[PDB]
Coordinates of C-alpha atoms in Angstrom, one line a residue:
Chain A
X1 CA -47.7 40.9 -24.6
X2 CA -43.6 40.5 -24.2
X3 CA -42.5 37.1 -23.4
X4 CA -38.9 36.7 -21.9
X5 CA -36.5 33.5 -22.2
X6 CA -33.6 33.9 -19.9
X7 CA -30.9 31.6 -20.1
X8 CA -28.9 29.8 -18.5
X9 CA -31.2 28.4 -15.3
X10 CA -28.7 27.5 -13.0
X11 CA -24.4 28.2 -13.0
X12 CA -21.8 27.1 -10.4
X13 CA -18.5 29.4 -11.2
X14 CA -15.6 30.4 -9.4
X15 CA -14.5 33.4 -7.6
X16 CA -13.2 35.6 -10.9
X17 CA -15.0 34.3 -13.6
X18 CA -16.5 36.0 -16.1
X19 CA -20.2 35.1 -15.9
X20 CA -22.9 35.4 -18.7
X21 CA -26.7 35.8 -18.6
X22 CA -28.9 36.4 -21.3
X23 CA -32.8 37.4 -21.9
X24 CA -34.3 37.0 -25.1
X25 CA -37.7 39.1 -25.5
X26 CA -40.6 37.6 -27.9
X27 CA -40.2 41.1 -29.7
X28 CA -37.7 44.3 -30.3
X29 CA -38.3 46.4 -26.9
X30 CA -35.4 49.1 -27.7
X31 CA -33.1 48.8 -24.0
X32 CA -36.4 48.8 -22.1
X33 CA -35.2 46.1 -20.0
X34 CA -33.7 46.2 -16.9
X35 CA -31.5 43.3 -14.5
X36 CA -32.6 42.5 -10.9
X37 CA -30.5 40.5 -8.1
X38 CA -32.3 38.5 -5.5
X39 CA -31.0 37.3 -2.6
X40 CA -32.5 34.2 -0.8
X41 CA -35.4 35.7 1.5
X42 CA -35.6 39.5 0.1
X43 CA -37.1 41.4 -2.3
X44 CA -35.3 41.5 -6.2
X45 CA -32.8 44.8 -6.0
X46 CA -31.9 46.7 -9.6
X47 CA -28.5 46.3 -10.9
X48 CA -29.1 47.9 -14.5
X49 CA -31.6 50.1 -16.2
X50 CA -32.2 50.6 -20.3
X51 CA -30.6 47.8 -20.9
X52 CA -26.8 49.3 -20.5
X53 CA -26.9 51.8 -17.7
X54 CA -25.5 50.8 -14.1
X55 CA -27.5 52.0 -11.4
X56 CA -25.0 54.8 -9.6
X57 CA -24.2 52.8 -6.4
X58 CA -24.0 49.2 -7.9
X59 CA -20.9 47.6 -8.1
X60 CA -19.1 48.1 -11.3
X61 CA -18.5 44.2 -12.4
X62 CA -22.2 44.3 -13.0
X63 CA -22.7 45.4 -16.6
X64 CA -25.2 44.9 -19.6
X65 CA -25.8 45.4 -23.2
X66 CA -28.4 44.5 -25.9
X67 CA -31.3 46.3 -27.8
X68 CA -34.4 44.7 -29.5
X69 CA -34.5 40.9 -28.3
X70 CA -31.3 40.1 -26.9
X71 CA -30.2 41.1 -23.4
X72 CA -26.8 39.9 -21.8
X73 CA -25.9 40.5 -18.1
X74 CA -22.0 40.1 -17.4
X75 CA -20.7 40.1 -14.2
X76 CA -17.2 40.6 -15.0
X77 CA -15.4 39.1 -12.2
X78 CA -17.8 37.0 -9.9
X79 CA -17.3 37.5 -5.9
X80 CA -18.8 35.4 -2.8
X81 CA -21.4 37.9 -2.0
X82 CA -23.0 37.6 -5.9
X83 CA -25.0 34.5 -4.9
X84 CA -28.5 34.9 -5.6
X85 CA -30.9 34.2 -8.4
X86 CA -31.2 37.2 -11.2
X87 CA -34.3 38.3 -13.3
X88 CA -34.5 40.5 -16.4
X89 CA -37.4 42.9 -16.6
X90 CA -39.1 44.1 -19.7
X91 CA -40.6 47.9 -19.0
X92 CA -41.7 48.2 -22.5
X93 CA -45.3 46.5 -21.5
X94 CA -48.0 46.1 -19.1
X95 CA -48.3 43.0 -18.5
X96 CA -45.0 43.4 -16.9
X97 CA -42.7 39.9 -17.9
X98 CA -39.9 38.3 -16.0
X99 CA -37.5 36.2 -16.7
X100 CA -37.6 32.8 -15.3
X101 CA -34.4 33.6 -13.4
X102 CA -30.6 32.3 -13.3
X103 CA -29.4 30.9 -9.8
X104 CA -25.8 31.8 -9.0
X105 CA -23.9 29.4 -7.1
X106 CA -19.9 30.2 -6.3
X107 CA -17.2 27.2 -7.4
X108 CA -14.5 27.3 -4.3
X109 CA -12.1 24.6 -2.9
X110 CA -13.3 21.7 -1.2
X111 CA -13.9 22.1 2.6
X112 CA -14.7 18.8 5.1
X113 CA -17.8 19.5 7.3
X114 CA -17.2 20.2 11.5
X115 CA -19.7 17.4 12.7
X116 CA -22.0 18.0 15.8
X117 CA -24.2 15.4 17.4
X118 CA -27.5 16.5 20.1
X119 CA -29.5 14.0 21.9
X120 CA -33.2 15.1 22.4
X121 CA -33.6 17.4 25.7
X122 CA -35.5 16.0 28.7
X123 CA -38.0 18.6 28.2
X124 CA -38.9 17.0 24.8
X125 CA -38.9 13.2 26.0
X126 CA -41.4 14.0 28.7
X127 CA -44.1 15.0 25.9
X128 CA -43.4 11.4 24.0
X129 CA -40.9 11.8 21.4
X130 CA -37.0 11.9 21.1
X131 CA -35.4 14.4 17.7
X132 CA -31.9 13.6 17.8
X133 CA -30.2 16.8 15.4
X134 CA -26.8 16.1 13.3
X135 CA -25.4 19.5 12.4
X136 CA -22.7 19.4 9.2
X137 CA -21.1 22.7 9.6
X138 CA -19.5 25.1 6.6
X139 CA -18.9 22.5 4.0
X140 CA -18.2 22.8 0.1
X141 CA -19.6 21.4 -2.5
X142 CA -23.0 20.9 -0.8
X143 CA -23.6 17.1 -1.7
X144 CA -23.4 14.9 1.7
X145 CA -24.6 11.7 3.2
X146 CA -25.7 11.6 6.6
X147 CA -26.6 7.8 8.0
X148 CA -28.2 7.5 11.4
X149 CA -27.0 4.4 13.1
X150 CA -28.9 3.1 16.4
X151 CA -27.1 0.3 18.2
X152 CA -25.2 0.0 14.9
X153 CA -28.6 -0.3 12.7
X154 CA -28.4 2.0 9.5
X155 CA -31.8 3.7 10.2
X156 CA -33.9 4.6 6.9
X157 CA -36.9 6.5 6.4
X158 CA -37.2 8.3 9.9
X159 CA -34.9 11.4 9.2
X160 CA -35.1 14.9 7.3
X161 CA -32.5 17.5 6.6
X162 CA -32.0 21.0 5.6
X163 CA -29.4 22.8 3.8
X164 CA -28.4 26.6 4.4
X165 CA -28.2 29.0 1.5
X166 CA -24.5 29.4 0.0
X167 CA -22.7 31.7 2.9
X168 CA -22.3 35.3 1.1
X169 CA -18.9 35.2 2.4
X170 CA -16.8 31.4 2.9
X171 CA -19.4 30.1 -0.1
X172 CA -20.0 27.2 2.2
X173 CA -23.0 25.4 3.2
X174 CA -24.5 23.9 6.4
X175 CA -26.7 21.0 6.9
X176 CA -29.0 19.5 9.6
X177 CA -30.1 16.2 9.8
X178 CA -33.4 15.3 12.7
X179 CA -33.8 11.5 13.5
X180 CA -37.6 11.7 14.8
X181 CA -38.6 8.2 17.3
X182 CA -41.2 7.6 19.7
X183 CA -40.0 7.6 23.6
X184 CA -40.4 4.2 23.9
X185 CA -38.2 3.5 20.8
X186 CA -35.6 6.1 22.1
X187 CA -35.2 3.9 25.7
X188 CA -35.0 0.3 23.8
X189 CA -31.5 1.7 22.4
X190 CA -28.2 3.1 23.6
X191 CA -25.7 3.7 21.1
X192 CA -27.0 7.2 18.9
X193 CA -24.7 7.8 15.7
X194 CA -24.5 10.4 13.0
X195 CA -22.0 8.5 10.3
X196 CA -21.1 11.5 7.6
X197 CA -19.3 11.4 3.9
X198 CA -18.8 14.1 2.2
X199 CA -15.6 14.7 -1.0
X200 CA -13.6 16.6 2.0
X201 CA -13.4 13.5 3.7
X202 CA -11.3 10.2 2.9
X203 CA -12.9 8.1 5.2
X204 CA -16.8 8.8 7.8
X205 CA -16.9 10.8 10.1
X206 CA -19.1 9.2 13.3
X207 CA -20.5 11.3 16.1
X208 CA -21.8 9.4 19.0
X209 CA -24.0 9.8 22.5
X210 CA -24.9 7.2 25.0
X211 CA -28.3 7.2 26.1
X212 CA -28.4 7.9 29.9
X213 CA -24.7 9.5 29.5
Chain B
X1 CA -35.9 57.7 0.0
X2 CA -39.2 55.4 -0.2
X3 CA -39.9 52.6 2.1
X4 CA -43.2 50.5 1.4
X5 CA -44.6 47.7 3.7
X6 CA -47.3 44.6 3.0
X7 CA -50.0 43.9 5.5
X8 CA -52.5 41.1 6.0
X9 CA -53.3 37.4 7.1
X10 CA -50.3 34.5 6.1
X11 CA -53.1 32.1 6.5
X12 CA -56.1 32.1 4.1
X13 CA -58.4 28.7 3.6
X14 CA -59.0 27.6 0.4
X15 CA -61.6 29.6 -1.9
X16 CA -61.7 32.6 0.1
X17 CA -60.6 36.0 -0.6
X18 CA -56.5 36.9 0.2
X19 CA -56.4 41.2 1.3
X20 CA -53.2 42.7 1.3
X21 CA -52.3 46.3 2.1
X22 CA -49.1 48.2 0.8
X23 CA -48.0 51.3 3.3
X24 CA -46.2 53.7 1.1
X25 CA -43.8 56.4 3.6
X26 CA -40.8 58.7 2.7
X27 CA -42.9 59.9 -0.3
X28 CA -46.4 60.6 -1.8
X29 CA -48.6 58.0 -4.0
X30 CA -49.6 61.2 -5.6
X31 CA -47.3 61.6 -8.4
X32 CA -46.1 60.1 -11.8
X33 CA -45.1 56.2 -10.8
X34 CA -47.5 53.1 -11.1
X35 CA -47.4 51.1 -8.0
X36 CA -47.7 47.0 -8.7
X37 CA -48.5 44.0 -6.9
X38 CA -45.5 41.3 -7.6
X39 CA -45.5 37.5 -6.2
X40 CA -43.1 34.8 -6.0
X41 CA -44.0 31.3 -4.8
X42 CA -41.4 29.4 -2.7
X43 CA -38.3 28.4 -5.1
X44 CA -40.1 29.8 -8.2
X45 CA -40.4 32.8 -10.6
X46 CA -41.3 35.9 -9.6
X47 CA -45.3 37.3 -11.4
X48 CA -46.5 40.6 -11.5
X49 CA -50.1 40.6 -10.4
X50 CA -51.0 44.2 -11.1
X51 CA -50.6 48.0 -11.0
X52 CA -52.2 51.4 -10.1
X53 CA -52.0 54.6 -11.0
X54 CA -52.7 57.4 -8.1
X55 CA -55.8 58.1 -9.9
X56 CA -56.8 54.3 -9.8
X57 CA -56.5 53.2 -13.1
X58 CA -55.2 49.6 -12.8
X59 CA -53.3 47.3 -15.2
X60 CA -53.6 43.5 -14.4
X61 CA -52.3 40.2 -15.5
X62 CA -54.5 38.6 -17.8
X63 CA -53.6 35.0 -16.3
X64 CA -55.0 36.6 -13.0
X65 CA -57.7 39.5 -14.7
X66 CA -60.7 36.9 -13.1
X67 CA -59.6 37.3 -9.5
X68 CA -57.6 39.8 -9.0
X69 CA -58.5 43.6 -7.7
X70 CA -56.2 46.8 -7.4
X71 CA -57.1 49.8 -5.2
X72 CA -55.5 52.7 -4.1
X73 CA -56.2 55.0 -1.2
X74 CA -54.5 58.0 -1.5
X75 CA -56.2 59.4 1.6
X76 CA -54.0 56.9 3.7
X77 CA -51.2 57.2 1.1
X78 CA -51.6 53.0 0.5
X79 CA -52.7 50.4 -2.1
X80 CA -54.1 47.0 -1.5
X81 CA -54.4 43.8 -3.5
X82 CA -58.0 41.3 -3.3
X83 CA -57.1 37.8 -4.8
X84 CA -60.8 35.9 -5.3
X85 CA -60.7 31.7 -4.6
X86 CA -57.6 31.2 -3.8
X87 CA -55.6 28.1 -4.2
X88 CA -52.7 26.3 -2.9
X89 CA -51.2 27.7 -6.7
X90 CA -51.5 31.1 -4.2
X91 CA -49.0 30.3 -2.1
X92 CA -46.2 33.1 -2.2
X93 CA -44.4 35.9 -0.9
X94 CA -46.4 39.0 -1.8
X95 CA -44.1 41.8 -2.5
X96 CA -46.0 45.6 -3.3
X97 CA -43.7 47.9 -5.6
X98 CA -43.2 51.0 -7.3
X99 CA -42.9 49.9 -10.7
X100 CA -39.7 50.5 -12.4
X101 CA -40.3 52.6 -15.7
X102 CA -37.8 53.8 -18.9
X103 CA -37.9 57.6 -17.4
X104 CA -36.6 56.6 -13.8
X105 CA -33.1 55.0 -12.7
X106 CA -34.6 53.6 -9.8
X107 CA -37.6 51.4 -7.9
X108 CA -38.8 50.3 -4.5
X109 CA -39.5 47.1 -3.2
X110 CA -41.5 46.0 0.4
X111 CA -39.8 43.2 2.0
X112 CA -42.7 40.7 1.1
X113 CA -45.0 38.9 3.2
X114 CA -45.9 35.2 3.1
X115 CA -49.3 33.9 1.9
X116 CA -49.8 30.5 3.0
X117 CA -53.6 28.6 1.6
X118 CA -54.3 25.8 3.3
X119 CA -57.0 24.7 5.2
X120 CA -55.0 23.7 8.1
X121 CA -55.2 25.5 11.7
X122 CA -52.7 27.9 13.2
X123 CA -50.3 25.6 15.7
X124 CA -47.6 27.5 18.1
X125 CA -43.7 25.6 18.2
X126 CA -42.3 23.6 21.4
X127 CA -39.0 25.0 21.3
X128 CA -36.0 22.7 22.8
X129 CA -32.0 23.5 23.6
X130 CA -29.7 21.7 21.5
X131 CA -26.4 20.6 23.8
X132 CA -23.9 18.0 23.3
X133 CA -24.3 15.5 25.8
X134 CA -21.2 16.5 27.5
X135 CA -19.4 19.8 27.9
X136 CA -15.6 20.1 26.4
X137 CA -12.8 22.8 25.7
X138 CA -11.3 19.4 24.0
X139 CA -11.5 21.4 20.9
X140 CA -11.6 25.0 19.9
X141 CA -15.3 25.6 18.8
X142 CA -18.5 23.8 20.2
X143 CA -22.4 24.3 18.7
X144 CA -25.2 25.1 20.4
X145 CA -28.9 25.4 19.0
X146 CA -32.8 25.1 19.5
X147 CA -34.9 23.2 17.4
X148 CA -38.6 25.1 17.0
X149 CA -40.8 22.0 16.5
X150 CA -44.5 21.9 15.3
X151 CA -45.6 24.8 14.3
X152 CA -47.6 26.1 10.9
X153 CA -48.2 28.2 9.2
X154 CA -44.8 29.4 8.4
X155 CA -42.6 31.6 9.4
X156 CA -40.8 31.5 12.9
X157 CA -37.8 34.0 13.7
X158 CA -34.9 33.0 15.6
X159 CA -32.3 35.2 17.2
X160 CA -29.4 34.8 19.5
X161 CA -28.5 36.8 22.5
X162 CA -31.7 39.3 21.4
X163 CA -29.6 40.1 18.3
X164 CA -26.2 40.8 20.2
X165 CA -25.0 37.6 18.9
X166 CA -24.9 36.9 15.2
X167 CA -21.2 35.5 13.9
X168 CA -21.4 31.5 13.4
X169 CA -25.2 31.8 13.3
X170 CA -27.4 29.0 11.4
X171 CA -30.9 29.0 10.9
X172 CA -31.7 26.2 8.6
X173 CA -34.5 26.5 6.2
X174 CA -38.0 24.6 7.6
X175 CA -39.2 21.1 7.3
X176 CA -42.4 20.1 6.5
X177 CA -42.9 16.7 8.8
X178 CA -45.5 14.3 7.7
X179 CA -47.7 15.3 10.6
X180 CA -48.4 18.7 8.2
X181 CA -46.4 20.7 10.8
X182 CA -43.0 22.6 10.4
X183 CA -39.5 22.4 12.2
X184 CA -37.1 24.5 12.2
X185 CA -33.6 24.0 13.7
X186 CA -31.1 27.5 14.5
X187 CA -27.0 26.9 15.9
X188 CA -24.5 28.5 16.5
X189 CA -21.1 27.7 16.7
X190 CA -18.6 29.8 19.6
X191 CA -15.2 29.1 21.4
X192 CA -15.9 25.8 23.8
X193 CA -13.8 28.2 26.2
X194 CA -17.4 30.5 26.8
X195 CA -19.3 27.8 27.6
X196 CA -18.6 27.9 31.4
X197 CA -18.9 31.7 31.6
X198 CA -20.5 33.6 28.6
X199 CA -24.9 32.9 28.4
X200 CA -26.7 31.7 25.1
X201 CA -30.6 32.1 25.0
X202 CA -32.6 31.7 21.4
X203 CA -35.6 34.3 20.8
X204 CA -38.0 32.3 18.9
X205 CA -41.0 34.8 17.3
X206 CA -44.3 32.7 15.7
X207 CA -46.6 35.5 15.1
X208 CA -48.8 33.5 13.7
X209 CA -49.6 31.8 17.2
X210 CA -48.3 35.4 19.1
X211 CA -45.9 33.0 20.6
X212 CA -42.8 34.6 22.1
X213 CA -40.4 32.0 23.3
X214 CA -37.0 32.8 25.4
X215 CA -35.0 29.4 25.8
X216 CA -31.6 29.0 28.1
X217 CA -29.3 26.9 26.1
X218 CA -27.1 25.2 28.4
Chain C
X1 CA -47.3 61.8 -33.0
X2 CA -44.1 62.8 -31.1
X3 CA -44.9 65.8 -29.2
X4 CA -44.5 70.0 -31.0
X5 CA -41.7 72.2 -29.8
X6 CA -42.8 76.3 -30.7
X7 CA -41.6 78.9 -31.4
X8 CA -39.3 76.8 -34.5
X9 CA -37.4 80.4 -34.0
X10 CA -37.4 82.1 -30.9
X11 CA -35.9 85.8 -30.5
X12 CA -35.7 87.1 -27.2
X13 CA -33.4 90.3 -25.3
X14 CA -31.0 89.3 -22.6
X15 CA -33.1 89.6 -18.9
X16 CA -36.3 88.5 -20.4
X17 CA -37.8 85.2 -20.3
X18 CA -37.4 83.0 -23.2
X19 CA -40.4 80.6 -23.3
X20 CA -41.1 77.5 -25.6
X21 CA -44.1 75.7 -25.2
X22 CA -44.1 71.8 -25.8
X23 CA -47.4 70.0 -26.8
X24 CA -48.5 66.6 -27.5
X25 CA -52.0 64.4 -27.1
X26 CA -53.4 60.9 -27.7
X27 CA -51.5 59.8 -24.9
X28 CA -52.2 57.9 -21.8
X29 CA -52.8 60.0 -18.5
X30 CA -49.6 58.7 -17.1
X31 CA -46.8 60.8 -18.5
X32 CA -43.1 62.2 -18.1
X33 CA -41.9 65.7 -20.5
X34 CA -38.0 66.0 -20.7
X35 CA -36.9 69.5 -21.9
X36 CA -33.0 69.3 -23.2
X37 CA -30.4 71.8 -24.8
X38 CA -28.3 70.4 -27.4
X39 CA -24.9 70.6 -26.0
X40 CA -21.8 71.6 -28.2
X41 CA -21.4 67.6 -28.9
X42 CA -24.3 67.1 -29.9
X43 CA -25.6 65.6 -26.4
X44 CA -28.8 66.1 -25.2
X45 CA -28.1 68.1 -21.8
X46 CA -31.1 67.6 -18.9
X47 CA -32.7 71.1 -18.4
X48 CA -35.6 69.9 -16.4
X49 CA -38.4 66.8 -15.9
X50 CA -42.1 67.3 -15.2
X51 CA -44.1 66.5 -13.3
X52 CA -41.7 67.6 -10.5
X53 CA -41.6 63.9 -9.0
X54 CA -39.2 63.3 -11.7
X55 CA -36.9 65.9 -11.6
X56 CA -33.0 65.1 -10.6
X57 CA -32.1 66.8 -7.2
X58 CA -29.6 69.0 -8.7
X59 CA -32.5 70.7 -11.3
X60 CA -31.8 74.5 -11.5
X61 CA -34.7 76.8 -10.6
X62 CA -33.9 79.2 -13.6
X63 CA -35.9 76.2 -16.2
X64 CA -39.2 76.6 -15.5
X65 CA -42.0 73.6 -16.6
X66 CA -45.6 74.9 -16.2
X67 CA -48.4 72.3 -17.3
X68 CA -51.3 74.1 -18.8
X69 CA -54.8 74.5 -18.1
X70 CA -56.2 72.3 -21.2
X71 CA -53.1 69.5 -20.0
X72 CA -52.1 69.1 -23.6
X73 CA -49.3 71.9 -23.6
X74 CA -46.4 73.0 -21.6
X75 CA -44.9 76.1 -21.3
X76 CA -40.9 75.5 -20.7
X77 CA -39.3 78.8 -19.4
X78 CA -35.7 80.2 -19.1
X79 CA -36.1 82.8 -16.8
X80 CA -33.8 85.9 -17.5
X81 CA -32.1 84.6 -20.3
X82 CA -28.5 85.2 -20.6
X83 CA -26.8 85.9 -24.2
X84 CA -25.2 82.1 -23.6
X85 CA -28.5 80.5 -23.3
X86 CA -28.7 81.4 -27.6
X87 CA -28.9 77.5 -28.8
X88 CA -31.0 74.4 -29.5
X89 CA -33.7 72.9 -27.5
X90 CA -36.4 70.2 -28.0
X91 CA -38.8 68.2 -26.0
X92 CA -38.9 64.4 -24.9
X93 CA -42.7 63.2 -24.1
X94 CA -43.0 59.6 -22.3
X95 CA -46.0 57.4 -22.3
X96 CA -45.7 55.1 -19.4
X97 CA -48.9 52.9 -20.1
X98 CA -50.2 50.2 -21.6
X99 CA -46.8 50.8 -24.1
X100 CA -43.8 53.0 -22.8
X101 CA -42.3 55.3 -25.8
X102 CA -40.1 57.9 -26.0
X103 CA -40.7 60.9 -28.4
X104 CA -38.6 63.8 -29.1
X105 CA -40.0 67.2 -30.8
X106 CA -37.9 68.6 -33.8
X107 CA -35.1 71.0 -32.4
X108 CA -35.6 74.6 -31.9
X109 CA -33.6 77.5 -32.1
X110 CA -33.0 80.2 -29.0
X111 CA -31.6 83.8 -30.0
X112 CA -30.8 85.8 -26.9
X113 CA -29.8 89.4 -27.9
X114 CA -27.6 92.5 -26.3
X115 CA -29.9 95.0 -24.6
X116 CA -29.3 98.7 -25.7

């Protein structure tokens, strides 16, 4: 059976760069070997067949060279829309072998987050509890603190946040942060504060709501 | 060219049998290609499972050779996949293929469908409107959103406008609360000068539940 | 055993059809046959893939690929040769499964002559 050892795992680079991926196979498979993309929530799509040989259609920064054990993919001047993670294939062998995959991230300038605060709807407080949202919105790089202030007490432990995939275009992320209390937790307070650092920013940025208005 | 589609449950308990189905259109199954089985589980690898040839002659991944059937139907030009005792390791997007070979420049993919084991019950999402707490043109652009709360198993669509709105869209990725139950969270950012006049309504899809929800964000 | 490419010499007037047969065995079910010229550098030119599945779009009608009854061998036709069709051809055989390989016959030689 073919085993494959794709390297590196993960890259950050900038719009431009010369980017290098390589497969090494357990044993010679000629150019049997072919170079998938995948994008975050579809199927892997082929960039490169025996080895060398650009699929007609498919960008011409994508190339790829190699025959017996090692495989290089070059994309020779990364853009935006390259995000994804990328497989090699052997097709010498059933059992079929990927690689465990490189994910592509795209180096650009440093852009602040566009803060947004949400208190919970009446519709939600009715059923018992209160989600208060904090949206960061198209930010680079993706590391960001959020802190949750209530009547100015740093709140811990009662908050989870989710990160967008890299946009395909700005290479900015987006981030939202939930505050989850009970109703009767939610009406003992009245000042509701997102506080938010991030490398785009000198100094927090607060978004604030009165409870009651 | 070829378009192929997976079919069956998301949810399957614990040490029960996982069926999928793979529509094949645009061309035969009849022919020269072997047609595989591929899985990826969420923010790992991607593993082939198997492969069949039109005449059913199968090729399967000796990892998975215990459990694992592939069938073909020619008569409804499809294949299918049985997975034995499944596991929470079974969790994964289920893609069906047509394999890629050295005498071809090209392969097909489905779009995948998700495969979630557990042992927990099918629960339909509250949806609420996200709003700031008051309404301003004090700067250019202003957000708008719905969070999808409680729901399982995954996944929930969310579009804007039926689809006629997409530009400054953001549906963020799922969270699993500690209750067991997702949340899911989709904005949209547009001028604070629409607010008085244009409409925003998320179309929230859980399939899973057959709930169809149409919220007003105001 | 990389497939047999027959006649070696093949001798045929203008306006008949020049047929080559291609052979091979001891190979998996699932199979692809290439038939090539050898072009003036030395490239292997495409004449036609079987089974038809694999053919590219552009395939011209006048190279005929017929499978035959015992599975094993292949006729491969050029239907009213031309005096320009005088040249080298082979065959490529393809095992798909449990190992892909690729297998080319030796060349053989096409002599299309004037009609009296």
């Amino acid at each position: 059976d073919i085993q494959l050892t794709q390297s590196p795992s993960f890259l950050s680079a900038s719009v431009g760069d010369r980017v290098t991926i390589i497969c090494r196979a357990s044993q010679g498979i000629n150019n049997y070997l072919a170079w998938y993309q995948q994008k975050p929530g579809k199927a892997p799509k082929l960039l490169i067949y025996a080895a060398s040989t650009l699929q007609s259609g498919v960008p011409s920064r994508f190339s790829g060279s190699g025959s017996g054990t090692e495989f290089t993919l070059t994309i020779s001047s990364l853009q935006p829309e390259d995000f994804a993670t990328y497989y090699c294939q052997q097709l010498d062998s059933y059992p079929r072998t990927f690689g465990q995959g490189t994910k592509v991230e795209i180096k650009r300038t440093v852009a602040a987050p566009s803060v947004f605060i949400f208190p919970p709807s009446d519709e939600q407080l009715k059923s018992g509890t209160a989600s208060v949202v904090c949206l960061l919105n198209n930010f680079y790089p993706r590391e960001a603190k959020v802190q949750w202030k209530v009547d100015n007490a740093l709140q811990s432990g009662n908050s989870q946040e989710s990160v967008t995939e890299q946009d395909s275009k700005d290479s900015t992320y987006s981030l939202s942060s939930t505050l989850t209390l009970s109703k009767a937790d939610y009406e003992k307070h009245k000042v509701y504060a997102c506080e938010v650092t991030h490398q785009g920013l000198s100094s927090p940025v607060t978004k604030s709501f009165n409870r009651g208005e | 060219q070829v378009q192929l589609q997976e079919s069956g449950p998301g949810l399957v308990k614990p040490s029960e049998t996982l069926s999928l189905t793979c529509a094949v259109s645009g061309h035969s199954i009849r022919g020269s290609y072997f047609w595989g089985w591929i899985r990826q589980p969420p923010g790992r690898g991607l593993e082939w499972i198997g492969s069949i040839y039109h005449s059913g002659s199968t090729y399967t991944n000796p990892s998975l050779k215990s459990r694992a059937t592939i069938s073909v139907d020619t008569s409804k030009n499809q294949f299918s996949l049985k997975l034995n005792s499944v596991t929470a390791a079974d969790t994964a997007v289920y893609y069906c293929a047509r394999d890629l070979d050295i005498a071809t420049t090209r392969d097909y993919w489905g779009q995948g469908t998700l495969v979630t084991v557990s042992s927990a019950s099918t629960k339909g999402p509250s949806v609420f409107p996200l709003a700031p707490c008051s309404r301003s043109t004090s700067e250019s652009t202003a957000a708008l959103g719905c969070l999808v709360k409680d729901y399982f198993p995954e996944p929930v669509t969310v579009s804007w406008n039926s689809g006629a709105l997409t530009s400054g869209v953001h549906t963020f990725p799922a969270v699993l609360q500690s209750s067991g139950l997702y949340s899911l969270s989709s904005v949209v950012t547009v001028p604070s000068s629409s607010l008085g006049t244009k409409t925003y309504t998320c179309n929230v899809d859980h399939k899973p539940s057959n709930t169809k929800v149409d919220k007003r964000v105001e | 055993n990389p497939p047999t490419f027959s006649p070696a010499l093949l001798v045929v007037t203008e306006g008949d059809n020049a047929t080559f047969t291609c052979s091979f065995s001891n190979t998996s079910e699932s199979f692809v046959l290439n038939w090539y010229r050898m072009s003036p550098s030395n490239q292997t030119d495409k004449l036609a893939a079987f089974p038809e599945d694999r053919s590219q779009p552009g395939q011209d009608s006048r190279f005929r690929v017929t499978q035959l009854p015992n599975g094993r061998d292949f006729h491969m036709s050029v239907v009213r040769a031309r005096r320009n069709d005088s040249g080298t051809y082979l065959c490529g055989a393809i095992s798909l499964a449990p190992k892909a390989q690729i297998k080319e016959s030796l060349r053989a030689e096409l002599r299309v002559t004037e009609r009296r």
